[PDB]
Amino acid sequence: MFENITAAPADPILGLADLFRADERPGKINLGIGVYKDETGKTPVLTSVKKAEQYLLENETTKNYLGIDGIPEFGRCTQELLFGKGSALINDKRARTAQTPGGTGALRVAADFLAKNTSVKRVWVSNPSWPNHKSVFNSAGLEVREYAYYDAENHTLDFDALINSLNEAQAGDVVLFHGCCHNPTGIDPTLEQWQTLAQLSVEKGWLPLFDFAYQGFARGLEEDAEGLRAFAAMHKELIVASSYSKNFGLYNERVGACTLVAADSETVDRAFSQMKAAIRANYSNPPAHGASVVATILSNDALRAIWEQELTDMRQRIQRMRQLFVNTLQEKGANRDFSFIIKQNGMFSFSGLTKEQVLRLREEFGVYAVASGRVNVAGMTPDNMAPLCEAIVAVL
Amino acid sequence: MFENITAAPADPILGLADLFRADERPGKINLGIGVYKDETGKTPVLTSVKKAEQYLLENETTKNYLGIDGIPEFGRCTQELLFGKGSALINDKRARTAQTPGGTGALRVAADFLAKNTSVKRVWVSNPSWPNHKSVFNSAGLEVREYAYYDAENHTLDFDALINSLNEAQAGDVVLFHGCCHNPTGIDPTLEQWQTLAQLSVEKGWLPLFDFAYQGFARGLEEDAEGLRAFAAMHKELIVASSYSKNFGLYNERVGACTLVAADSETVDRAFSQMKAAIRANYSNPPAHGASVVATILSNDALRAIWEQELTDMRQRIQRMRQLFVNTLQEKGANRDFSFIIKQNGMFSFSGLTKEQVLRLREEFGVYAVASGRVNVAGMTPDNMAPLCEAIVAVL
Numbered sequence A, B: 001m002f003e004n005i006t007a008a009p010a011d012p013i014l015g016l017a018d019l020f021r022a023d024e025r026p027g028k029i030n031l032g033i034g035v036y037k038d039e040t041g042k043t044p045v046l047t048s049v050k051k052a053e054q055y056l057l058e059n060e061t062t063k064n065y066l067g068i069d070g071i072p073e074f075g076r077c078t079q080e081l082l083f084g085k086g087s088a089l090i091n092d093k094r095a096r097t098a099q100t101p102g103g104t105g106a107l108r109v110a111a112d113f114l115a116k117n118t119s120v121k122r123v124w125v126s127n128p129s130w131p132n133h134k135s136v137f138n139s140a141g142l143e144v145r146e147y148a149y150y151d152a153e154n155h156t157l158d159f160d161a162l163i164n165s166l167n168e169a170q171a172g173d174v175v176l177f178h179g180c181c182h183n184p185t186g187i188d189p190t191l192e193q194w195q196t197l198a199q200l201s202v203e204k205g206w207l208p209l210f211d212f213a214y215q216g217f218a219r220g221l222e223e224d225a226e227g228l229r230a231f232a233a234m235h236k237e238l239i240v241a242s243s244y245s246k247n248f249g250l251y252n253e254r255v256g257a258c259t260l261v262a263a264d265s266e267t268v269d270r271a272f273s274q275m276k277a278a279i280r281a282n283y284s285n286p287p288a289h290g291a292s293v294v295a296t297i298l299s300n301d302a303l304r305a306i307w308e309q310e311l312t313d314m315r316q317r318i319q320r321m322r323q324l325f326v327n328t329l330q331e332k333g334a335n336r337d338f339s340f341i342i343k344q345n346g347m348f349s350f351s352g353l354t355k356e357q358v359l360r361l362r363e364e365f366g367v368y369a370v371a372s373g374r375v376n377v378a379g380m381t382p383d384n385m386a387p388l389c390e391a392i393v394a395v396l
């Protein structure tokens, strides 16, 4: 039976880590997967996290199953982070949050939930976008359409093309938005643009689905949440899939949340029971460790102050690297203007390189980037910056 | 869009956990969820586990993404436990193992893998079986069919009704088998019977899918895999979904594995690539903590030895309770013979109690059991034995 199975190609992002760990030429540089690295080129576990893990080691007395929707405090803390402490959505209890296995896990339960319990037939995702978005929704039988987003000429948001592109998005259709730090462009809407979209969304009757994987990597925790909060203030229903993989450096512990919002408590509770059913038929209940760490940190003011500082330091080093990247490109002889990089938010930067050039950097200079030209700025250091820029320049 | 979603019914097993936690009675007894309890009625963290966690805390340097199929050593360690160190399967590199979030997650990926890449349309599950089996398969789009298995009149396995039932299973169909400690009956086939079903399996042309969540709870690690091993020696292809929730007391860390077996190394690798695709579109990659604990214990002879001792102690305590349960029932004046209970394997026991009786135990006596009459013997202790048996006799 397994003979008739056709091999699947490598993941355009995770496949990368395999090739990288394979070639043996010295000096190779990895700018693929979206993981943070400090100035030494390592992805350390945060201090606040190590602290929380010791607390857990000392006070944990059982690994007994969590409820299908996870740790109660985890759910509460994520809603405050998303909508704000005094938020009306919370006070009126219009939101229920399920702890999931990473941001990916949250998108999948949201997809299963929609496919099996609603009349949703189509999901609109930005072009370009995180590659796995289409795979997740397709796995639930949902048709995925794309809408315009990036102005490849001006290196800005093509807002007119975006609006025009979504003209055919029907009422009942789901529209996917990146909370902040758009992957892979690094270009997010302004608050005014978010407000325009929120209004457009209600009038057309779209079901907004927010992918929030980098809260705090643009400007700050609250600031990065402005777009989402502009929608939540005007929408009856909406879904937000968030991830703690990045802002807590907990990649492999798989910590995420799928937050469901309905018109009133009675409706959200009813629909949430169906979401739990979807979870039960998938992985049953969520892994405790990562989520426990997070709930511990967000609940203790001492740890919370620590973590916030560590997050601030990560954001800052990334921005510092962005300026260093542009300066060194010039220094090494690039005639093309890369100033636009300084305007992009988050870990990534859409370089502009072509699939041909990205392939040259890899096989010829041992520099790894994703085939779409996306390069991970969080992976650049004062030590590989020069070799890196010299490679890019040689391929331009 | 969420206005007309009908509420879902509570899970027949996880739902009870909520009712129990809420129950105000101070004398309430929990025999519902399949969770182990020690002599004091607690679900402790194994000492082997606690030590492994201590190591991880002081030696883990990064939380970097853990590869789609998880920790390599983990995969290798689960293959030896399932097939034996010097297995031809392992030597001929015919097996590929993916670390998954629990046994349930392993079952879901297998289902997604089959529905998306093969011609498989129906899965055969024993009647009775774990209630969530049907839910996992229906969710992936597969239809679920039941085969006879239990002789309620003799509290024994109906080998003739079983084989007479699977006659309707066409070629290309999947048949679900419980490695050992069948849930909820506790009655497993003898090696002889395993030999038969195996040969019958290859002949009728079925794809065997084993659910292995209790390895070590029937007789021992090696002994409980006999049935599986008999199948592996004859089949070209097979799927095994295992769990470490129970034998490592790591329920909430979600530690399981999905193992694919094919005719040769070329075929399995090609097939495994699609399984990784199914995983990538579900939760992307597995949670490291739980899996890391198992890997470090199974890899360290000293820890390994401690763990096996603890597992032996859990198994024997359950057997002791099994015997005590039957002796106490008579002592309390049971109007029947529960001698068959001594012949059951694992954590459970199919009491024979009716749904009405089970409801009565909960409401009037605060004793919680599954509505199917399944009782968790591992949840019984020298302290709650008397109150418990008095409750059952009162409903008899």
Ligand SMILES: Cc1ncc(COP(=O)(O)O)c(CN[C@H](CCC(=O)O)C(=O)O)c1O
Pocket: A013, A014, A032, A033, A034, A035, A101, A102, A103, A104, A105, A130, A132, A178, A183, A211, A213, A243, A244, A245, A251, A254, A255, A256, B283, B284
């Ligand atoms: C927009 C976006 N959504 C969801 C996720 C999923 O997060 P989690 O790992 O919690 O499930 C990522 C991770 N960004 C990827 C990391 C590697 C990958 O999974 O491809 C990246 O853009 O490199 C992401 O950028």
Ligand SMILES: Cc1ncc(COP(=O)(O)O)c(CN[C@H](CCC(=O)O)C(=O)O)c1O
Pocket: A283, A284, B013, B014, B032, B033, B034, B035, B101, B102, B103, B104, B105, B130, B132, B178, B183, B211, B213, B243, B244, B245, B251, B255, B256
């Ligand atoms: C046959 C069987 N398969 C799969 C599982 C899944 O285990 P994991 O938690 O690794 O995904 C269990 C757990 N036995 C259940 C535990 C509670 C539940 O999930 O219903 C039980 O029968 O009580 C099981 O008995």
